Design a protein around this ligand. Structure first.
Ligand SMILES: CNC(=O)[C@H]1O[C@@H](n2cnc3c(NCc4cccc(I)c4)ncnc32)[C@H](O)[C@@H]1O
Length: 377
């Protein structure tokens, strides 16, 4: 049978196959290589991916996401207490563990995190099956290096529910190191800087004669590209109020349309210096039309960008490493395409350039597919 590779991310998943000596990262049915890790339970229908994420605006309590934050944890863990206060869907205490409670045709229905992760895995499986034109029973799935045995087992149990035998769990730093094809000979120390949509992770990964070991991990569980978008949102909501006497927060639809254009403007500003954010009738009879510059984008987010260095100092300290001891810096996550992020890391490493890919959102799934290939020989 085939073995596919799946990056089960906090905010998104990504699936790759190894076939005819190449890794193919697969498109979902909307033509995207990244699928939002969302599941909606509205109006007697269950949706997974972007179609579910679009329900979050009008049905926030029925639109489940960020389940990776809960999986294999305890209801009373300090992190889960925080996540319950942030997440808009109901989380209940089932015998010491967080479960998700929603309604299906008005009936209360409770799910383990691994039942919701299983639905994401099922969708990635179906993309692979369609593409390979055969059934898929086996996968390599990625986890964060800091995941404990209960978090790993809960991820494997998600696979079993989705009809996937997870033949190997590999950590996200190792997957990145496989994708970038880092030389496995001799000893090299690698700083893997992973800045995603919602989470920041940094790891020191040591490769020694083909053996991969994560010597230290740190991060910020509530720092990612979505926060940079929110800083921009906050700025233009204040401006629109000043100019128009309209508080766009009073209209949830207006906020949804703004967040979509702000996320595009942010991407543009990784390449250009100035971009237009435009929504016709953001509310009836009022257009939104603004310019954002890279300089203002950076100014709005500079403290968040610099916060990413605090986990870098922590892993260098935990590992008793000098900065010079790092041989190579590898960037993962779309947010590492931000020029200021790259500059800040370079300058922290007293001038050393970070290695980055071209598709840093897909590098982990790519490495998971390589690992699948490695396992089949
Ligand atoms: C969607 N998944 C994520 O991990 C996050 O990654 C962000 N994300 C993707 N892509 C980005 C970008 N792209 C410009 C670009 C394009 C090509 C080359 C170069 I240099 C630069 N800029 C800034 N954040 C970017 C998203 O906005 C989420 O928050």
């Amino acid at each position: 049978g085939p073995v596919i590779g799946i990056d089960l991310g906090t905010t998104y998943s990504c699936v790759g196959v190894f076939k005819n000596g190449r890794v193919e990262i697969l498109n979902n049915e909307l033509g995207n290589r990244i699928t939002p890790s969302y599941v909606s339970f509205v109006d007697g229908e269950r949706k997974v991916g972007e179609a579910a994420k679009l329900e979050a605006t009008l049905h926030p309590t029925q639109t489940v996401f960020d389940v990776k934050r809960l999986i294999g944890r305890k209801f009373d863990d300090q992190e889960v207490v925080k996540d319950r206060s942030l997440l808009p869907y109901e989380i209940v205490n089932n015998q010491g563990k967080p479960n998700i409670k929603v309604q299906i045709k008005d009936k209360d229905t409770t799910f383990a995190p691994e039942q919701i992760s299983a639905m994401v895995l099922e969708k990635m499986k179906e993309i692979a099956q369609s593409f390979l034109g055969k059934p898929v029973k086996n996968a390599v799935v990625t986890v964060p290096a800091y995941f404990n045995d209960a978090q790993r087992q809960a991820t494997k149990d998600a696979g079993t529910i989705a009809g996937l035998n997870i033949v190997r769990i590999i950590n996200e730093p190792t997957a990145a190191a496989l994708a970038y094809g880092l030389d496995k000979k001799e000893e090299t120390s690698i700083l893997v800087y992973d800045l995603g949509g919602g989470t920041f992770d940094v790891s020191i990964l040591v490769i020694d004669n083909g053996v991969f070991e994560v010597y230290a991990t740190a991060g910020n569980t509530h720092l990612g590209g979505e926060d940079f978008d929110q800083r921009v949102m906050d700025y233009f909501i204040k401006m629109f109020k000043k100019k128009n006497n309209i508080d766009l927060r009073t209209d949830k639809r207006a906020i949804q349309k703004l967040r979509k254009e702000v996320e595009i403007a942010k991407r543009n500003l990784s390449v250009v210096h100035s971009t237009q954010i435009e929504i016709e009738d953001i509310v009836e009879g009022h257009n939104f039309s603004e310019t954002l510059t890279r300089a203002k984008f950076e100014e709005l987010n500079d403290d968040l960008f610099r916060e990413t260095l605090e986990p870098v100092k922590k892993v260098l300290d935990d590992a008793k490493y000098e900065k010079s001891k790092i041989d190579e810096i590898v960037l993962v996550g779309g947010s590492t395409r931000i020029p200021k992020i790259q500059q800040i890391i370079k300058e922290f490493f007293n001038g050393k350039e970070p290695n980055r890919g071209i598709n840093p959102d897909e590098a982990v799934a790519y490495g998971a597919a390589i690992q699948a290939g490695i396992i089949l020989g």
